[PDB]
Design a protein around this ligand. Structure first.
Ligand code: CLA
Ligand code: CLA
Ligand code: CLA
Ligand code: CLA
Ligand code: CLA
Ligand code: CLA
Ligand code: CLA
Ligand code: CLA
Ligand code: CLA
Ligand code: LHG
Lengths: 738, 165, 39, 54, 118, 61, 80, 144
């Protein structure tokens, strides 16, 4: 029986526990004796497993926490809309998108920082934004600042509702454990109601507001002169003036004569040629199809009536001869362990974000987006980074499950058990394939460097010497370009210009052209494969050996996060799964930095540029230069950092400052990464003596950071430094040459 | 003058840099309307630029061969040639405020060590006692030299040391 | 209310209030007295 | 066990690859070899300084 | 125990591994060496010819490829000899491994010489 | 030796609380080598606030 | 083999014994402390030098000390 | 109490076979063999990875190092309240009993034990490294 189950008034709303730091932990509620306490207080603040053993209380805590997160995000969205309405040039940009730079941040005139308010056009001065909100707002049909202001107030109201919902569902009416364990009902409601009704209501908004307003905006009529959306809902005769299908109403829908809705539910493909974005009619049909699909999908699992599937029965039904008991026991694991769920959801959520990056660069969904090169670079890079971080998190929480929640006396000869039982074979094969990939992928680059340096270019791996053509990718590309003719008859064009074909340009700039693939693309793709495989190796090794290894047979009893097991047995530093997350973080940074460099150079070289033929931003140097390390060093890094290094005295000077600052923070991380806390503790001893001499020794004893906190501080400053460096480089480059 | 440096009111590269910055600001200015907000902001920027160059030439700063103000850090040379307001008066101003902060922190520590929970007062600040010591710390150099002369500024050799001392 | 002022007496809250006061005092000084290099 | 390194039988009884690296890294630290006296120390230092000269 | 697997414990795989010359248990180490050398030198003659630095100069690509292959076979035979000198202090003995390394040298040079004719 | 509750001073040089002040808990009257039990208000690097000392390692100061 | 020593500041709390992952230490009769128990290290040939014993000891300073000496196959923790 | 003997015909726990098992150290140097008597049939965690059902009665497992046998001993002793003992086996067939070599577990005092490696002094009363220079080897000053 699926029903609402709630306990009344569990936790009194009181300011008492605000005044007692570390109340949540029996160890930390004793008070601070040394400085380590503070760090512990913040590190274990949200580790609810270390607070209680009771799954119900933990579940309630995570529920209200999620509400807090949603309220924060709503505050953030409210801020973006309010700043877009009050401190922007959005209307001016609407009147001239091709020659006005999107700006929605202005600085105050103090200490000379006023110079950052640059000439972005439209009679405005501010910081040019690259988040892409302007294109999203134009695509949604927003025309005035008033509507943005109203959206800001609405989002603030929703933030207040989310914080009230958090307080309410923790302190007043907090759900019971068997409410949270209704996973079949949760999937039904989220697949129907969330994704399904979400895309249904959005398709409603599109068909009724987006399509007419953007059709008029593409027609050329002044935005203020375009009818307001409520007049588009109210008087259907205007909707019939743009698309005569609307004259017949919803009569073709119920009578199944859906073909008459082909005015606004299309299958054109390609891009809008005057606008450089996907057709909103294609997007409307897409969201209608997505809606119907998800609402069908949301009626799959049995709840309070006989019909519907059961998750444990589907899992226990798939058993073979090679795997033994198969998927038995997995339902119990995924309905009692939050960390397993978090690992799965983080992996797929990160992967999904990377897919979002690729599909949004390749098939520009917003108008005047493809030619806002800064926005495209920013969006791709951003969502790729977010993706990578969520994948590393997935590996982390997988390992946390493996140490804290794994219990083999309910999990005995299972898929998980066999994985743990042949982990040596898995890791050794992954090891070998990583070394193989490293040798041949990186070795081609080193080979080319040597041959080019020795004056023998005919012996290189290139398009003119020893060729290594991406035959398979070229074949898939050609097939997808020829797809509208035979295997997709109702498609007018291909799904993306990059497959092949003509060229769509807007305002003299290239929106998208066919992307060619040669030896350089072969080499970078195998570099990507190598780095990804190594990252998977580290993380997977971390999760498979989290409990035990031949080195530490009882590693599980030492916890998930611990520094080592002493200098014996040769040395056991970084044996914990946490340390494997730490190394996977560095390798994830490596991989995604090479990925975004690939994207940046390739787009600036073979795609972007002006139309007179097409003059590219870097003239097409990718195909001959991206085969040597010196080529990346000179033609990419050195050449394209001109803009960042000479940005002083202009509006881009902040990117130079953050270039230097990011380099500094990156180097600053090396002190934590390369050293150890014994030295620092002894140094602190001397300093403590000096403070004792002058009666200024604190009652809370100064302690050097822990080993694991030294590693954490190290990797955090390392990531912040490197990522912010590439951020400043990218933004200054693409804003100046864009 | 000092070290072969010309005064900034006499330096030519100083006036050249002033004219160059005004030229950059008016090249940014000449692409707007007359009474618009970017025009008002850039005219306020030009006003502050002219006022800043007039104030630096007024104060008797020394410029080099590039037209930039140079500072003199020697007490007697700066007191002799009238450059005491750039290092000497700033260094005694800094020593006043830095010793203020240090003396207020030291008095807070000695005030909270004499209780049953010194660490609990270190985490959660006694705000009235902190404000009382913050207002009383204006006579910190007098109280500092008095604690120096009584021998109560220093702890004796009851300090913590290592076995080879 | 006693516990709310005890929470406001904690270290990061007072550090936030005090650095907001100090930074705002420096910002108002650099506004009304633009660009001081000497004296 | 093995011969190398001939100055340390604690390293010579090492069954691992640690023996090679620690025989390389401890070859010229004569004060902590097996059976090293003080006259032997000064004599090997004097001959080693001749080797550097050559 | 050891993990039971249809790759590690297949019958036809076990017979195929028993038929290869590293496992026949009763043939001479010289015969094992010459068979392993005739396999490996013949396969190693290839990429030095097709991809080496003289691959595009006619009439000399196969000569330099086979000559570099013979040099590599000599290096491999020296490696076998020092491995046997360090390891043992019929195939797993000092005399047997020295006969095996000499047989590998002879068979590898013969395989390279037969690949030059082919 | 010293009495319960009295303040003593530690002269063991390889101790964390050398040249510092603690409080006597108990003195064992057997033939134990280190009978003086002294608690300290601050903890060492191992998180311990109690150590045993000899008679010539404590001075009631 | 590593060098493990026990010093007379031991109070026979048995913490070091229950911390060793290799069973090297044991408690013997003694008369030097109130607990009438002292640690002893009769099997230092199996000691790897992990120093869990030193972590478990409450005394200041340590009453058990591990001096990393010459490595063997047992002290390196090798299963191969 | 007398020293027990190894029965090689003791039934092993129910286990499908891991990759973390024995290696050539078991054939060339030594391998260690653990034995306990169980009260009921119950799943435990193998220290080399995976789950295993123990049999009711005697059980027998062989590991590669001593720490694996201590980890299984600690698991079977703290979680299941059992009394195991693990031996040392050489490829000749030589059997060396240990843990508990006294018969009583070392975490409690027993008469008859002789204290080894006990310095009867403090740690601050060690000599300086100048006093032990030019011996036959490296010496820490705590060796004397
Ligand atoms: C406004 C009235 C109010 C009051 C008096 C309380 C009081 C309490 N809550 Mg409740 N609760 C409330 C509203 C309130 N809550 C709201 C709005 C939510 C949804 C978030 C919750 C959800 C909730 C959960 C899940 C839990 C509590 C718990 C508690 C108890 C202890 C927590 C504590 O003392 O740390 C006080 C914490 C803070 C003062 C820090 C707030 C952190 C904010 C939310 C994060 C956002 C800051 C933001 C990111 C800015 C950062 C900028 C930059 C520097 C990064 C205490 C009785 C806990 C408990 O009962 O344990 C036994 C517990 O687990 N509350
Ligand atoms: C959520 C993200 C977000 C971010 C990053 C920004 C960022 C900015 N805003 Mg925007 N804004 C936002 C959301 C955001 N805003 C929202 C949701 C609204 C509607 C309420 C606004 C309405 C708004 C206006 C009207 C203005 C800005 C302005 C600014 C700029 C300067 C801010 C400043 O100096 O304030 C002043 C600094 C302070 C008030 C510091 C005091 C902090 C206190 C002391 C902390 C005390 C700690 C306490 C426990 C926690 C806070 C509790 C809270 C209830 C007070 C800065 C770019 C200004 C601007 O753009 O100028 C051109 C401006 O005029 N914002
Ligand atoms: C069809 C109804 C429905 C909808 C739309 C949702 C939607 C959501 N649930 Mg789910 N939930 C449902 C039924 C539903 N739930 C049922 C029946 C159960 C019990 C089996 C759960 C148990 C559950 C748990 C344990 C959690 C969620 C969470 C979430 C949020 C995921 C965050 C996100 O990406 O959304 C995008 C964000 C939005 C779309 C914002 C709009 C949200 C508003 C409130 C509309 C959603 C409708 C809402 C359910 C109606 C509430 C009415 C209320 C006044 C009584 C999302 C808002 C997670 C969460 O974040 O909690 C805070 C979470 O931890 N749900
Ligand atoms: C999912 C979101 C969504 C929403 C909200 C709408 C809404 C609408 N569509 Mg649209 N439509 C959609 C998706 C959506 N559509 C999609 C996906 C397609 C493609 C197939 C279309 C294709 C389409 C066409 C071709 C047309 C519409 C039309 C309409 C309008 C009239 C429909 C109607 O008569 O419904 C039936 C009436 C109701 C459902 C009434 C609602 C119930 C009321 C509010 C209850 C009130 C009860 C309460 C007690 C009384 C108030 C008391 C209070 C004052 C105190 C309406 C604004 C028509 C139009 O006007 O176009 C401009 C039209 O011609 N739609
Ligand atoms: C650029 C510096 C650098 C290099 C060369 C390496 C190299 C490697 N890392 Mg390391 N890593 C690095 C930075 C680097 N890392 C940093 C900064 C960290 C700290 C975050 C790490 C942390 C780390 C982790 C956690 C892991 C690695 C692993 C590896 C190995 C991957 C396997 C492989 O591809 O083999 C191929 C070898 C190469 C690509 C090296 C260059 C080979 C050249 C080009 C050809 C060799 C022929 C040579 C020229 C002949 C010389 C002859 C001469 C001696 C006479 C590889 C040796 C992984 C591993 O070992 O698992 C498989 C692994 O898991 N590293
Ligand atoms: C940090 C170290 C330092 C150094 C390297 C200098 C360097 C100098 N001092 Mg300065 N000064 C300093 C700190 C320093 N000062 C401090 C802390 C005070 C406050 C006590 C002064 C107060 C002071 C006065 C009143 C005068 C100088 C002068 C000078 C210049 C020549 C001095 C000389 O020839 O004697 C050798 C240098 C030293 C012994 C170093 C210590 C300087 C002492 C404190 C003063 C020496 C003054 C000198 C005897 C008078 C020379 C008269 C001149 C006309 C020849 C020389 C550039 C003189 C000047 O203006 O020349 C143009 C001068 O009249 N200084
Ligand atoms: C640590 C080295 C250092 C030093 C010595 C200075 C010194 C100065 N900076 Mg610089 N600056 C620094 C680091 C430093 N800064 C860093 C790290 C940054 C990046 C964050 C900056 C970014 C910066 C900017 C953007 C500006 C300055 C400015 C100034 C001048 C401010 C004078 C003032 O505040 O009014 C007087 C201050 C007070 C009256 C407050 C003190 C209150 C007490 C009670 C007075 C007591 C007096 C007796 C002063 C010369 C300003 C300037 O125009 O320079 C010419 C300015 O606009 N700094
Ligand atoms: C002036 C003459 C001199 C003499 C006679 C000595 C003698 C000694 N030193 Mg001292 N020392 C010296 C100068 C000297 N040192 C200098 C210049 C440095 C700074 C580098 C040091 C820093 C130093 C340290 C930190 C230590 C010693 C130690 C020692 C003792 C043992 C050395 C040993 O066995 O290691 C054998 C040496 C090696 C195996 C060297 C390995 C190779 C090194 C890392 C350089 C690798 C770079 C490589 C060659 C580059 C190739 C590039 C490629 C592309 C071509 C011996 C008493 C050790 C000691 O006393 O222990 C208690 C010890 O720990 N020395
Ligand atoms: C690792 C990547 C890599 C690759 C693929 C190459 C490839 C090449 N190099 Mg380059 N080289 C490299 C790295 C690499 N190099 C690096 C890092 C350096 C600097 C140290 C150089 C410096 C260099 C120089 C100076 C020269 C070359 C040359 C060459 C060419 C011929 C080499 C040769 O004849 O070897 C012989 C080839 C083999 C022995 C092949 C062995 C590998 C086999 C195929 C593996 C088989 C596995 C099989 C599938 C398993 C089946 C199992 C089953 C039977 C059971 C060839 C194109 C030569 C040239 O002229 O360039 C055109 C040349 O003069 N290289
Ligand atoms: C090929 C893999 C076939 C995998 C496959 O067909 O599995 C199918 C095989 C049969 O499973 P069952 O029929 O017993 O499954 C029953 C249930 O457990 C699942 O419904 O499962 C295994 O035996 C797992 C063994 C994996 C053996 C290692 C394969 C590693 C391949 C790594 C290389 C991948 C390269 C490409 C990546 C994109």
């Amino acid at each position: 029986k699926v029903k609402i189950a709630v306990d009344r008034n569990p936790v009194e709303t009181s300011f008492e526990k605000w005044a007692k730091p570390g109340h949540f932990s029996r160890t930390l509620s004793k008070g601070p004796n040394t400085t380590t306490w503070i760090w512990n207080l913040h590190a274990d603040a949200h580790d609810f497993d270390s607070h209680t053993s009771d799954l119900e209380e933990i579940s309630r805590k995570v529920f209200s926490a999620h509400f807090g997160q949603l309220g924060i995000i709503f505050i953030w969205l409210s801020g973006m809309y309010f700043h877009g309405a009050r401190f922007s040039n959005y209307e001016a940009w609407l009147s001239d998108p091709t020659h006005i730079k999107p700006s929605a941040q202005v600085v105050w005139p103090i200490v000379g920082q006023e110079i950052l308010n640059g000439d972005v056009g439209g009679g405005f001065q501010g910081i040019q934004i690259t988040s892409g909100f302007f294109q999203l707002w134009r695509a949604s049909g927003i025309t005035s600042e008033l509507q943005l202001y109203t959206t800001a107030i609405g989002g603030l109201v929703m933030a207040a509702a989310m914080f009230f919902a958090g307080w309410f569902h923790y302190h007043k009416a907090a759900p019971k454990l068997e409410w949270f364990q209704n996973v079949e009902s949760m999937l039904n409601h989220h697949l129907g109601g969330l994704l399904g009704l979400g895309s249904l209501a959005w398709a409603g908004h599109q068909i009724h507001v987006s399509l007419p307003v953007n059709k008029l905006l593409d027609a050329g009529v002044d935005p203020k002169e375009i009818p307001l959306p409520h007049d588009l809902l109210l008087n259907r005769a205007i909707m019939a003036d743009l698309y005569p299908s609307f004259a017949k109403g919803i009569a073709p829908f119920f009578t199944l004569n859906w073909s008459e809705y082909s005015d606004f539910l299309t299958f054109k493909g390609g891009l809008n040629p005057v606008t450089g974005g996907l057709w909103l009619s294609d997007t409307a049909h897409h969201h209608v199809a997505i809606a119907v699909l998800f609402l069908v999908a949301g009626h799959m699992y049995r709840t309070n009536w006989g019909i519907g599937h059961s998750m444990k029965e589907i899992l226990e039904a798939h058993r073979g001869p090679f795997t033994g008991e198969g998927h038995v026991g997995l339902y119990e694991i995924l309905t009692t362990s939050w960390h397993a769920q978090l690992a799965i959801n983080l992996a797929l959520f990160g992967s999904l974000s990377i897919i979002v990056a690729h599909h949004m660069y390749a098939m520009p969904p917003y108008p005047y987006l493809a030619t806002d090169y800064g926005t495209q670079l920013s969006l791709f890079t951003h969502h790729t980074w977010i993706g990578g971080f969520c994948i590393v998190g997935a590996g982390a929480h997988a390992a946390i499950f493996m140490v804290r929640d794994y219990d083999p006396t309910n999990n005995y000869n299972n898929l998980l058990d066999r994985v743990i039982r042949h982990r040596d074979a898995i890791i050794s094969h992954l090891n070998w394939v990583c070394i193989f990939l490293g040798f041949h992928s990186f070795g081609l680059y080193i080979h080319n460097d040597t041959m080019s340096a020795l004056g023998r270019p005919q012996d290189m791996f290139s398009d003119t010497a020893i060729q290594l053509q991406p035959v398979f990718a070229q074949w898939i590309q050609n097939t997808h370009f020829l797809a509208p003719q035979l295997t997709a008859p109702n498609a007018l064009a291909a799904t993306s210009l990059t497959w092949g074909g003509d060229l769509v340009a807007v305002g003299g700039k290239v929106a998208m052209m066919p992307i060619s693939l040669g030896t350089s693309d072969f080499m970078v793709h195998h570099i990507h494969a190598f780095t990804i495989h190594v990252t998977v190796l580290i993380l997977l090794k971390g999760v498979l050996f989290a409990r035990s290894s031949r080195l530490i047979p009882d590693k599980a009893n030492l916890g998930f996060r611990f520094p080592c097991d002493g200098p014996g047995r040769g040395g056991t530093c970084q044996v914990s799964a946490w340390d494997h997350v730490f190394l996977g973080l560095f390798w994830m940074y490596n991989s995604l930095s090479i990925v975004i460099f690939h994207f940046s150079w390739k787009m600036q070289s073979d795609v972007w540029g002006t139309v007179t033929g097409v003059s590219h931003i870097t003239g097409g140097n990718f195909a001959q230069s991206a085969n040597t390390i010196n080529g990346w060093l000179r033609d990419f890094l050195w050449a394209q950092s001109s803009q960042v290094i000479q940005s002083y005295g202009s509006a881009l000077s902040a990117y130079g400052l953050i270039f230097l600052g990011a380099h500094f923070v990156w180097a600053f991380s090396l002190m934590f990464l390369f050293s150890g806390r014994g030295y620092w503790q002894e140094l602190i001893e001397s300093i403590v003596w000096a403070h004792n001499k002058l009666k200024v020794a604190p009652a809370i004893q100064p302690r050097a950071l822990s080993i694991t906190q030294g590693r954490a501080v190290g990797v955090a400053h390392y990531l912040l430094g490197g990522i912010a460096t590439t951020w400043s480089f990218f933004l200054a480059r693409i804003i100046s040459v864009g | 003058d000092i070290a072969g440096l010309t005064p900034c009111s006499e330096s030519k590269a100083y006036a050249k840099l002033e004219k160059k910055e005004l030229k950059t600001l008016e090249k940014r200015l000449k692409q707007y309307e007359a009474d618009s907000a970017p025009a008002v902001a850039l005219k306020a920027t030009m006003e502050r630029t002219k006022a800043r160059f007039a104030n630096y030439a007024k104060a008797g700063l020394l410029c080099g061969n590039d037209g930039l103000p140079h500072l003199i850090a020697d007490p007697g040379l700066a007191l002799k040639y009238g450059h005491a307001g750039e290092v000497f008066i700033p260094t005694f101003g800094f020593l006043y405020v830095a010793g203020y902060i240090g003396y207020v922190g030291r008095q807070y520590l000695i005030a909270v060590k004499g209780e049953a929970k010194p660490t609990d007062k270190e985490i959660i600040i006694d705000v009235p006692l902190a404000t009382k010591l913050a207002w009383q710390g204006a006579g910190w150099p007098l109280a500092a030299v008095q604690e120096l002369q009584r021998g109560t500024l220093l702890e004796k050799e009851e300090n913590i040391t290592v076995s080879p001392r | 209310m006693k516990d709310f002022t005890t929470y406001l007496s904690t270290a990061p809250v007072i550090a936030t209030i005090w650095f907001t006061f100090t930074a705002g005092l420096l910002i108002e000084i650099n506004r009304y007295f633009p660009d001081p290099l000497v004296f | 066990h093995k011969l190398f390194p001939k100055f340390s039988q604690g390293l010579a009884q090492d069954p691992t690859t640690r023996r090679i690296w620690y025989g390389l890294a401890m070859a010229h630290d004569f004060e902590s070899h097996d059976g090293m006296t003080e006259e032997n120390l000064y004599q090997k230092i004097f001959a080693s300084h001749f080797g550097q000269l050559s | 125990g050891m993990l039971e697997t249809p790759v590690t414990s297949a019958p036809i795989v076990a017979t195929y591994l028993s038929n290869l010359p590293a496992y026949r248990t009763g043939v001479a180490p010289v015969l094992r060496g010459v068979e392993i050398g005739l396999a490996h030198g013949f396969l190693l003659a290839g990429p030095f010819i097709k991809l080496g630095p003289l691959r595009n100069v006619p009439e000399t690509a196969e000569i330099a490829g086979s000559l570099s292959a013979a040099g590599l076979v000599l290096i491999l035979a020296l490696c076998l000899s020092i491995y046997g000198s360090a390891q043992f202090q019929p195939l797993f003995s000092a005399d047997g491994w020295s006969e095996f390394a000499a047989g590998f040298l002879v068979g590898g040079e013969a395989g390279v010489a037969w690949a030059y004719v082919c | 030796g010293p009495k319960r509750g009295s303040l003593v001073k530690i002269l063991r040089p390889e101790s964390y609380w050398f040249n510092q002040v603690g409080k006597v808990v108990s003195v064992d009257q057997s033939g134990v080598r280190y009978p003086v039990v002294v608690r300290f208000e601050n903890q060492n690097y191992a998180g311990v606030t109690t150590n045993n000392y000899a008679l010539d390692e404590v001075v009631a100061a | 083999a590593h060098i493990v020593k026990i010093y007379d500041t031991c109070i026979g709390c048995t913490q070091c014994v229950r911390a060793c992952p290799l069973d090297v230490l044991e408690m013997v009769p003694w008369d030097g402390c109130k607990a009438s128990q002292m640690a002893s290290a009769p099997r230092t040939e199996d000691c790897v030098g992990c120093k869990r014993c030193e972590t478990a000891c409450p005394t200041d300073f340590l009453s058990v000390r591990v001096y990393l000496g010459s490595e063997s196959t047992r002290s390196m923790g090798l299963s191969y | 109490w007398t020293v027990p003997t190894l029965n090689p015909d003791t039934p092993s726990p129910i286990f499908g076979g891991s990759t973390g098992g024995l290696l050539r150290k078991a054939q060339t140097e030594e391998f260690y063999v653990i034995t306990w008597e169980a009260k009921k049939e119950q799943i435990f965690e193998m220290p080399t990875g995976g789950a295993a059902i123990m049999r009711q009665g005697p059980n027998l497992l062989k590991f590669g190092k001593k720490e694996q046998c201590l980890a299984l001993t600690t698991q079977l002793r703290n979680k299941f309240k059992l009394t195991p003992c693990f031996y040392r086996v050489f490829p000749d067939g030589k059997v060396q009993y240990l843990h508990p070599a006294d018969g009583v577990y070392p975490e409690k005092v027993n008469a008859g034990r002789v204290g080894a490696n006990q310095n009867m002094r403090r740690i601050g009363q060690n000599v300086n490294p100048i006093k032990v220079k030019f011996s036959g080897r490296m010496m820490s000053p705590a060796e004397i």
